[PDB]
Design a protein around this ligand. Structure first.
Ligand SMILES: CCCCCCCCCCCCCCCCCC(=O)OC[C@H](COP(=O)([O-])OCC(O)COP(=O)([O-])OC[C@@H](COC(=O)CCCCCCCCCCCCCCCCC)OC(=O)CCCCCCCCCCCCCCCCC)OC(=O)CCCCCCCCCCCCCCCCC
Ligand SMILES: CCCCCCCCCCCCCCCCCC(=O)OC[C@H](COP(=O)([O-])OCC(O)COP(=O)([O-])OC[C@@H](COC(=O)CCCCCCCCCCCCCCCCC)OC(=O)CCCCCCCCCCCCCCCCC)OC(=O)CCCCCCCCCCCCCCCCC
Ligand SMILES: CCCCCCCCCCCCCCCCCC(=O)OC[C@H](COP(=O)([O-])OCC(O)COP(=O)([O-])OC[C@@H](COC(=O)CCCCCCCCCCCCCCCCC)OC(=O)CCCCCCCCCCCCCCCCC)OC(=O)CCCCCCCCCCCCCCCCC
Ligand SMILES: CCCCCCCCCCCCCCCCCC(=O)OC[C@H](COP(=O)([O-])OCC[N+](C)(C)C)OC(=O)CCCCCCCCCCCCCCCCC
Ligand SMILES: CCCCCCCCCCCCCCCCCC(=O)OC[C@H](COP(=O)([O-])OCC[N+](C)(C)C)OC(=O)CCCCCCCCCCCCCCCCC
Ligand SMILES: COC1=C(OC)C(=O)C(C/C=C(\C)CC/C=C(\C)CC/C=C(\C)CC/C=C(/C)CC/C=C(/C)CC/C=C(\C)CC/C=C(\C)CCC=C(C)C)=C(C)C1=O
Ligand SMILES: CCCCCCCCCCCCCCCCCC(=O)OC[C@H](COP(=O)(O)OCCN)OC(=O)CCCCCCCCCCCCCCCCC
Ligand SMILES: CCCCCCCCCCCCCCCCCC(=O)OC[C@H](COP(=O)(O)OCCN)OC(=O)CCCCCCCCCCCCCCCCC
Ligand SMILES: CCCCCCCCCCCCCCCCCC(=O)OC[C@H](COP(=O)(O)OCCN)OC(=O)CCCCCCCCCCCCCCCCC
Lengths: 110, 52, 153, 62, 20, 98, 88, 63, 251, 101, 49, 50, 172, 104
């Protein structure tokens, strides 16, 4: 298990580091983001919001929903792209949002 | 629960550690069935306080 | 709110020790009747609005803990005393006193606790005039205020 | 159709009072809001003098 | 985890606004 | 004022079924009374049983005889009325749907 | 008594419990109407009672059934029509 | 109230005297109860198919 | 004897009975085909618990009737009173019945998660349907007005497949062409219900003034059971079970 | 103290045993997780209590020594079976930590 | 020594603290709804921290 | 019927309600039985917070 | 062994609950109006004004409801006759006697009530001046009858559903 | 994170079309998914499509600071693989592409 994890870490973080080491004339930012996507979007620190109710209580869940929406509002974020949506209701019980998508602001969940 | 599910209970005891603590392991269930109630109820109260 | 709950409980205990007059008893009887009709004997989930459903269920759970569970505990204590008495008398284990004496104790202790905490249950149902439960609660409150010659929330 | 949602767009005032003039103005199909909803959250480009002149020359649709 | 908290107080509702 | 009009074909079929069912019901009631009397006579003469048991058996025999006699009209009217009620309910729902 | 209060409509009264546990063991016999034999027994008893009423109708204030009337025949005949115990 | 009163009356009558002919309805009810007990025993110790065959044969013989 | 032979030898007797009986009975009662299906589903769900409990109790009695005899060691009342044993067996049957009834009818609230919705772990669908029906059910306490009856009669030929081409004849319609077109569009094209018209509501209030004086609210809109009952749960925004559905609800 | 608004968040005493403050969401989550950590040890504690009792009572030479004739161990997957509990500990730790992160 | 005291002491202590000290609530506060909640005891003092 | 110019601001309109009768707006708002207590609590909280 | 034992069945053969469009199809105009009014008053009184509700309830109690209850009570007393059914100077079998009485009396009450309804409901509908006058006043239609039928079935369903939890029901 | 589905597989064919349209490392896929969500239940309506486009405009404006007229004066509304949501114009273009890909 440790060896597989270390191999994945190498593939994501060590070998790609050597792909680019000098300024690039063409598509420098594109290539840098290509090499950075595999490392910055690892599921270990991205997955989990789908089962956030395990630790977030209903009111805490709504507060953390608004907090996460504010935090990941930035469009340029592959981590936000790969993260589970915050536009959902607590499975156990919801107290703030009656219907998903019925807001007064496209960003604020309330 | 445990050894009863196996049709070779001697093998069940041998293959884990070659040790026999089944008496205590099966007598502990009765105590464990009630030792948790105070902690569970206080935890319910604490969870309600957190929710409030 | 723990301080508020303690103060309310102590106030109810002091009032019960003090006793009640005719007008106070009439108001308490009206409050208890309203609570029994609209909360204790009615499924709260059948109300229209989610807010009123939630607050009615909160009042119902508070009533359960402060009346039904307390009466069960006191009746169980009385039934256990009777059980010890009968066990000593017969020099054997007896099972009849538990159910019957427990039921009698619950029936005796439910009215007293309900009278002690009648005002709290009535006040906890003040959802607001925008809802049917709140409107009925306000009507009963107006009746009680007229009876008592005072104004209450 | 079941999954259709507004997603917070054009969530302007929804009058509840019976006699509020908005309850009729919004019903009126030929009603123009002071500014389009998408533009309501975008930075202004015209100068102060230009904006004042436009507001002064603005005429109500009725 | 699944039920590590072992209980959730769904009864506790969002406190209702009471301002005039 | 105008009111919902039922289908004339169904009305006529129900009228025929109802006439037949009334005639049956009457004749079958008489047949059931006769069957109860005959069963009581047989039980009290050839059967060694208590009076309560004999009377219960006679009542059940008479009821069964009446039901056997009147089943045809009862079943025909039941099916015709069920079909007519279904048609009327569907028509009224289609009219009042909104 | 005060039938006016009972007539009065109320949300809680309408949505409250009307039939309690004690009534079920005392009223479960009403399901026997499903049986054709029981229906026939009841019809025979009703017809006999109607015949007795008609015979005794000579006294003032008592009127027996008239076969001419459509309503009486229809109500007497369609009482058990379409009976279904499964549908509430 | 009715049950208590009837139990009291029955106990008093039984204590006082018992050699009195009872009503036909009550006698038939008691006979039916005894017959039902015997029939329960027979059903318990006999098969349903055997019971049905015996009853059918008896009915045919009666006819 | 011909009818008796027909009754005995009807092939329907051999043919297995289906679940359409409840739907047909409800349609005869008056419920629409969809409303009949929803009500039949609710009733079947309510009664399935009881049926399953009865079957389970019967099977338990059949397989383990010797437990009652064995228990006589600790409770000789069973040995020396067969009536007590019969009452105990009846109590066991009722216990199984009540367990099944609790499983299939009790609220048993659970989370609205697609991963386990519909697994019967929680009686969420039945609880929500029952709550919605009881909350939103209010019998129409009015009398249908003349305008409503006339509109219902006029709705004989309406169809949404193709819009009707309305033609204005002054000699039979009166008023002006524009006003007649507007009224027709309001009545039929717009889909507005007859009771939603202002004059209809005013007439309803005038006719039911007595109820209003007594203090009873008048329900303009008749109850629509299909607007509150949904066995699939899509109406109540209940997430369908993932493994049996190929789509998702936002919630 | 910002006017009558008391902004102080820590009111710990000289013999504080818990966290300095519980107003922060992170600290609230940590406290709840720590409290519920000890709830899942009932069976293990009871088993160890019984083991200690038996060893202290009957396993001494005086009372009831046992002739241990086993030569060598034969366990093969008991480690896998036993390490489910630390697996649960790790799963809970990862869940709480990632939720906070 | 091993089981009952260890598994009931903290809960008993917290219950008594709530009974007799209002879970250490600092009074003189306004509008409990807006005010923060003073939680009951949650850190196991009997367990090795 | 409406005057066909509903919502138009009258020429010279002044946003003054010096002599307006507020009794006609009583039915447009609902105050709970504890309105006085809520008012006092609001005043206390504002004074002690702002 | 099915619904007819544990479900509600006492409301299906009384109070005109069996009236449907089949009767109305053959009924004349006045008879149809009378039948529709009777069904609406019995099943959904909400459509009637309070005064009409009170008057109709009084008439129904006088004619059918209370009369059937009294006749059922008389039949139940007839069943009670001879209590205790089986007893002796040694034992009285109180539990057996109570069981027999509880089994027999309600059945006799049901038989008597059904007899009273079957006999008098048609006559009450046909030859009641109050019902005739109220039917003429209200002048219900087939649409009203269909709405009342659906509402009555929904009321029966609601009554059955409400009594689901008669022992334990927290709510949430 | 800001989409309407827990994972991209829950979304219909529109999410797959967005993935095909944009490169795996390009975060414009999220904006395309937002456009899909806006277009759910509106593309098949002449007014619904315009409403979805206005929703895209509002979403871009709320995501990034923007001036009045920029989105109207965008020269090319087409999107290529290496287009990133670094500007309101790019966000709006990605949202429009998602709306177009949306089927129902
Ligand atoms: C410092 C000091 C203080 C402490 C400080 C803190 C220290 C921290 C330390 C941390 C250390 C971390 C590691 C901890 C683990 C260490 C383990 C170690 O070292 O030892 C190795 C130890 C060795 O194994 P073992 O525990 O000895 O195995 C023995 C079994 O566990 C035991 O089971 P068994 O099968 O071998 O024997 C029991 C069985 C044997 O008995 C039998 O014969 C079975 C009988 C079954 C049928 C019963 C009913 C029969 C009825 C007949 C008819 C009656 C009359 C009619 C009446 C009708 C009406 C009433 O009977 C039962 O009791 C089973 C019954 C089934 C229960 C569920 C039934 C539900 C329905 C109800 C039925 C019964 C009641 C109704 C009756 C009728 C009602 C109508 O454990 C391991 O192997 C590793 C454990 C790792 C943890 C996970 C394990 C999961 C696998 C399952 C086992 C779980 C239990 C054991 C867990 C371990 C703790 C207890
Ligand atoms: C002294 C006492 C003092 C007491 C004091 C204390 C009193 C306290 C108060 C007590 C108050 C109590 C009040 C209530 C008491 C009375 C209750 C009452 O009315 O209940 C009687 C009740 C009244 O019946 P009903 O509902 O009015 O009859 C409807 C009419 O028949 C109308 O039927 P339909 O015409 O519409 O269609 C069916 C058709 C007949 O058409 C058919 O063939 C129908 C076939 C249906 C499917 C059969 C499938 C068989 C395969 C196995 C099952 C497969 C699963 C599916 C089953 C679905 C349900 C059938 O019927 C006819 O037309 C037959 C002619 C009628 C005259 C003959 C009567 C014969 C007996 C009735 C049953 C006959 C069944 C024949 C079956 C076929 C034989 C070749 O009678 C029954 O329940 C039926 C008779 C008894 C059956 C007992 C069976 C025991 C178990 C046997 C197991 C072994 C055999 C299994 C296989 C079958 C044999 C091969
Ligand atoms: C009849 C209808 C039929 C329809 C048609 C069906 C057609 C067939 C289709 C079948 C398709 C398959 C369906 C399967 C469904 C399974 C359930 C499900 O969906 O759950 C998903 C479940 C969703 O549950 P959730 O997150 O809690 O959400 C709430 C639910 O949605 C809902 O929650 P809720 O609101 O209902 O209740 C809340 C709460 C309230 O409940 C509780 O708190 C209960 C707490 C205790 C547990 C339940 C009682 C246990 C009793 C003791 C054990 C049995 C005793 C008797 C036998 C003796 C045993 C010794 O419950 C929970 O906490 C749920 C937790 C899940 C476990 C408990 C569920 C019941 C289990 C029953 C098992 C027995 C039945 C057969 C097996 C299962 C079915 C196939 O998803 C997960 O949690 C999985 C997440 C995975 C993340 C990635 C993990 C990566 C790997 C990391 C670890 C690696 C370890 C490596 C080890 C290596 C060592 C060397
Ligand atoms: C003999 C049975 C064979 C069963 C088939 C599976 C085992 C095959 C052989 C071992 C290698 C397994 C590699 C699985 C993952 C491959 C892809 C990968 O690394 O990325 C996904 C993930 C990484 O996902 P990610 O976060 O990079 O996500 C990529 C997508 N974005 C960027 C959009 C987020 O890998 C891990 O997380 C690895 C964690 C380490 C532990 C992995 C355990 C795998 C399962 C147990 C295998 C046990 C084998 C035992 C063999 C001997 C006994 C039989
Ligand atoms: C094989 C060896 C294994 C060893 C494992 C390690 C064990 C570690 C734990 C050891 C615990 C030893 C017992 C401690 C008892 C403390 C009781 C106490 O003060 O209450 C705490 C708790 C604390 O709760 P509290 O309500 O008093 O206060 C809580 C704290 N405040 C108020 C500040 C929030 O109280 C109780 O448990 C109350 C009931 C106690 C009933 C039992 C009393 C026993 C008294 C001592 C024994 C009898 C005297 C003679 C002994 C002779 C011995 C030879
Ligand atoms: C579920 O229940 C449980 C818990 O919950 C409470 C647990 O927490 C736990 C966890 C607990 C543990 C792992 C164990 C924790 C540790 C424990 C219990 C031990 C603590 C012991 C102490 C605090 C006492 C320390 C002992 C001492 C001897 C200190 C000194 C005291 C005394 C009276 C003697 C003083 C004497 C001197 C200083 C020396 C003077 C004398 C001399 C110098 C000698 C001179 C020489 C001559 C000749 C005169 C468990 C296991 C549990 O089961
Ligand atoms: C109503 C008021 C008046 C008084 C009645 C009160 C009724 C209360 C509720 C029902 C009570 C049921 C129990 C009755 C007493 C016990 C019956 C009995 O003996 O059942 C156990 C029996 C075991 O079989 P056994 O003959 O011992 O075979 C041994 C083989 N070595 O197995 C059996 O014989 C099976 C018993 C099944 C009991 C019913 C289970 C529910 C489902 C029934 C489905 C339909 C069964 C139809 C049977 C037809 C038989 C002709
Ligand atoms: C009754 C048998 C008692 C046997 C005692 C000896 C064995 C102990 C071992 C555990 C036995 C648990 C048996 C649980 C049976 C539950 C039966 C049931 O669900 O009945 C229905 C009841 C409420 O349902 P109701 O409102 O009546 O209507 C139907 C609802 N659709 O449903 C409910 O009440 C809801 C579900 C409750 C489940 C509770 C299970 C745990 C109970 C623990 C009690 C401990 C103390 C009991 C007294 C001392 C016993 C020694
Ligand atoms: C195969 C043939 C049999 C098929 C049917 C089997 C049914 C098994 C279930 C028990 C049947 C008892 C006898 C018949 C009763 C018929 C009426 C009935 O069942 O009423 C319903 C009620 C239980 O329903 P419940 O779920 O609690 O109420 C929910 C309401 N929404 O009913 C009750 O609460 C009544 C039962 C209470 C528990 C009694 C347990 C001991 C048995 C006593 C029987 C009665 C006394 C008889 C004494 C003389 C005869 C022996």
């Amino acid at each position: 298990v440790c060896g597989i994890y270390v191999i994945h870490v190498i593939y994501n973080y060590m070998i790609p580091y050597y792909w680019v080491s000098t300024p690039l004339k063409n598509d420098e930012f594109t290539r840098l983001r290509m090499k950075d996507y595999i490392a910055s979007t690892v599921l270990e620190e991205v997955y989990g919001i789908s089962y956030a109710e395990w630790g977030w209580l209903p009111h805490d869940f709504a507060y953390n929903r608004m907090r996460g929406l504010a935090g990941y509002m930035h469009p340029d974020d592959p981590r936000a792209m790969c993260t589970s949506t915050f536009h959902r209701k607590h499975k156990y019980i919801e107290h703030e949002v009656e219907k998903v998508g019925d807001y007064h602001h496209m960003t604020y969940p309330k | 629960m445990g050894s009863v599910w196996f049709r070779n209970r001697y093998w069940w005891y041998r293959s884990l550690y070659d040790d026999y603590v089944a008496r205590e392991a099966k007598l502990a269930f009765g105590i464990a069935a009630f030792i948790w109630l105070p902690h569970y109820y206080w935890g319910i109260h604490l969870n309600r306080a957190f929710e409030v | 709110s723990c301080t508020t709950r303690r103060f309310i409980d102590e106030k109810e205990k002091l009032e019960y020790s003090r006793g009640y007059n005719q007008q106070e008893l009439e108001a308490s009887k009206l409050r208890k009747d309203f609570v029994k009709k609209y909360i204790v004997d009615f499924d709260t989930t059948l109300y229209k609005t989610q807010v009123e459903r939630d607050w009615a269920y909160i009042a119902k759970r508070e009533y359960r803990y402060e009346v039904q569970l307390k009466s069960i505990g006191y009746g169980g204590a009385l039934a256990n005393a009777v059980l010890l008495w009968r066990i000593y008398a017969n020099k054997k284990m007896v099972f009849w006193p538990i159910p019957i004496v427990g039921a009698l104790g619950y029936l005796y202790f439910q009215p007293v606790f309900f009278q002690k905490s009648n005002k709290r249950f009535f006040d906890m149902c003040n959802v607001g005039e925008e809802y049917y439960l709140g409107r009925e609660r306000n009507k009963i409150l107006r009746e009680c205020n007229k009876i008592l010659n005072v104004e209450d929330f | 159709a079941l999954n259709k949602r507004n997603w917070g767009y054009n969530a302007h005032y929804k009058p509840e009072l019976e006699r509020s003039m908005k309850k009729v103005l919004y019903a009126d199909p030929n009603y123009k809001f002071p500014i389009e909803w998408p533009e309501r959250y975008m930075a202004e480009t015209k100068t102060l003098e230009q904006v004042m002149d436009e507001e002064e020359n603005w005429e109500y649709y009725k | 985890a699944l039920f590590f908290m072992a209980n959730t107080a769904i009864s506790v509702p969002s406190v209702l606004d009471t301002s005039p | 004022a105008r009111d919902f009009e039922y289908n004339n074909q169904d009305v006529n079929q129900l009228n025929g079924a109802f006439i037949s069912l009334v005639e049956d019901e009457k004749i079958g009631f008489w047949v059931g009374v006769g069957g109860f009397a005959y069963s009581q006579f047989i039980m009290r003469k050839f059967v060694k049983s208590t009076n309560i048991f004999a009377s219960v058996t006679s009542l059940f025999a008479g009821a069964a005889l009446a039901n056997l006699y009147t089943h045809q009209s009862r079943a025909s009217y039941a099916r015709v009325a069920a079909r007519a009620n279904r048609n009327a309910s569907l028509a009224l729902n289609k009219l009042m749907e909104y | 008594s005060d039938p006016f209060k009972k007539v009065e409509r109320d949300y809680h009264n309408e949505r409250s419990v009307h039939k309690h546990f004690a009534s079920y063991p005392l009223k479960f016999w009403w399901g026997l109407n499903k049986f054709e034999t029981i229906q026939g027994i009841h019809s025979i008893l009703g017809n006999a009672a109607d015949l007795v009423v008609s015979t005794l109708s000579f006294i003032p204030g008592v009127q027996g059934r008239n076969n001419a009337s459509y309503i009486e025949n229809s109500i007497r005949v369609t009482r058990f029509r379409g009976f279904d115990d499964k549908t509430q | 109230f009715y049950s208590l009163f009837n139990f009291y009356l029955s106990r008093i009558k039984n204590k006082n005297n018992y050699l009195v002919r009872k009503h036909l309805y009550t006698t038939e009810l008691l006979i039916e109860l005894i017959l039902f007990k015997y029939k329960l025993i027979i059903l318990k110790f006999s098969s349903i198919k055997y019971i049905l065959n015996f009853n059918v044969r008896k009915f045919i013989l009666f006819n | 004897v011909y009818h008796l032979f027909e009754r005995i030898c009807n092939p329907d007797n051999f043919k297995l009975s289906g679940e359409a009986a409840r739907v047909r009975t409800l349609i005869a009662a008056g419920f629409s085909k969809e409303e009949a299906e929803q009500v039949a589903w609710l009733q079947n769900h309510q009664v399935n618990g009881k049926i399953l409990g009865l079957f389970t109790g019967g099977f338990a009695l059949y397989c383990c009737n010797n437990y009652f005899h064995y228990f006589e060691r600790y409770f000789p009342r069973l040995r020396y009173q067969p009536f007590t044993k019969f009452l105990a067996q009846a109590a066991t049957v009722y216990f199984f019945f009540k367990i099944g009834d609790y499983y299939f009818t009790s609220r048993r609230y659970g989370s609205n998660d697609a991963r386990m919705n519909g697994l019967m772990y929680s009686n969420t669908y039945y609880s929500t349907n029952k709550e919605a029906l009881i909350q939103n059910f209010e019998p129409l306490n009015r009398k249908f007005t003349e305008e409503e009856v006339e509109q219902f009669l006029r709705n004989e030929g309406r169809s949404q497949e193709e819009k009707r081409n309305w033609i204005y004849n002054p000699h039979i319609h009166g008023s002006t062409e524009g006003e007649w077109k507007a009224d027709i569009h309001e009545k039929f094209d717009s889909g507005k219900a007859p009771w939603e018209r202002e004059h209809v509501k005013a007439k309803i209030l005038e006719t039911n003034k007595a109820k209003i004086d007594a203090g009873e609210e008048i329900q303009l809109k008749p109850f629509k059971t299909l607007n509150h009952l949904d066995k699939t749960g899509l109406l109540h925004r209940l997430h369908p079970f993932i493994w049996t559905n190929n789509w998702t609800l936002l919630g | 103290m910002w006017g009558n608004l008391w902004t102080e968040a820590s009111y710990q005493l000289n013999f504080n045993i818990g966290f300095s403050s519980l107003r922060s969401d992170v600290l609230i989550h940590l406290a709840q997780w720590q409290y519920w950590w000890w709830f899942w040890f009932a069976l293990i504690w009871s088993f160890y209590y019984f083991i200690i009792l038996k060893v202290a009572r009957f396993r001494v030479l005086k009372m009831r020594p046992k002739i241990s004739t086993s030569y060598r161990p034969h366990g093969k997957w008991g480690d896998f079976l036993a390490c489910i509990i630390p697996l649960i500990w790790c799963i809970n730790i990862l869940t709480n930590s990632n939720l906070i992160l | 020594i091993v089981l009952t005291w260890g598994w009931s002491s903290f809960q008993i202590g917290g219950y008594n603290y709530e009974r007799f000290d209002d879970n250490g609530e600092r009074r003189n506060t306004l509008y409990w709804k807006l005010s923060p909640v003073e939680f009951p005891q949650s850190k196991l003092w009997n367990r090795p921290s | 019927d409406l005057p066909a110019d509903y919502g138009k601001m009258p020429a010279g309109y002044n946003f003054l309600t010096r002599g307006k009768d507020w009794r006609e707006y009583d039915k447009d708002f609902i105050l709970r039985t504890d309105a006085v207590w809520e008012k006092f609590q609001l005043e206390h909280f504002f004074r002690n917070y702002m | 062994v099915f619904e007819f034992l544990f479900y509600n069945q006492q409301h299906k053969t009384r109070n005109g609950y069996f009236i449907n469009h089949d009767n109305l199809m053959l009924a004349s105009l006045e008879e149809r109006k009378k039948l529709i009014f009777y069904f609406i008053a019995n099943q959904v009184p909400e459509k009637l004004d309070p005064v009409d509700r009170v008057k109709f309830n009084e008439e129904l109690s006088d004619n059918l409801s209370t009369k059937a209850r009294l006749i059922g009570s008389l039949t139940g007393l007839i069943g009670l006759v001879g209590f205790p059914y089986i007893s002796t100077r040694i034992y009285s079998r109180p539990v057996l006697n109570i069981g027999l009485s509880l089994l027999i009396c309600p059945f006799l009450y049901y038989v008597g009530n059904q007899l009273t309804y079957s006999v008098w409901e048609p006559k009450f509908i046909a030859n009641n001046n109050t019902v005739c006058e109220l039917s003429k006043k209200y002048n219900f239609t087939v649409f009203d009858f269909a709405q009342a039928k659906k509402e009555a079935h929904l009321k029966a369903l609601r009554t059955e559903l409400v009594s689901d939890n008669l022992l334990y029901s927290p709510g949430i | 994170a800001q989409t309407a589905h827990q994972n991209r597989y829950q979304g219909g064919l529109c999410y797959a079309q967005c993935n095909e349209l944009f490169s795996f490392w390009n975060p414009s896929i999220q904006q395309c998914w937002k456009g899909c969500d806006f277009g759910v239940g509106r593309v098949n309506d002449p007014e619904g499509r315009i409403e979805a486009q206005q929703m895209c405009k509002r979403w871009a404006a709320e995501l990034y600071w923007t001036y009045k007229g920029e989105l109207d004066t965008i020269k090319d509304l087409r999107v290529h693989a290496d287009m990133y949501p670094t500007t309101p114009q790019n966000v709006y273009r990605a949202c429009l592409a998602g709306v177009r890909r949306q089927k129902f």
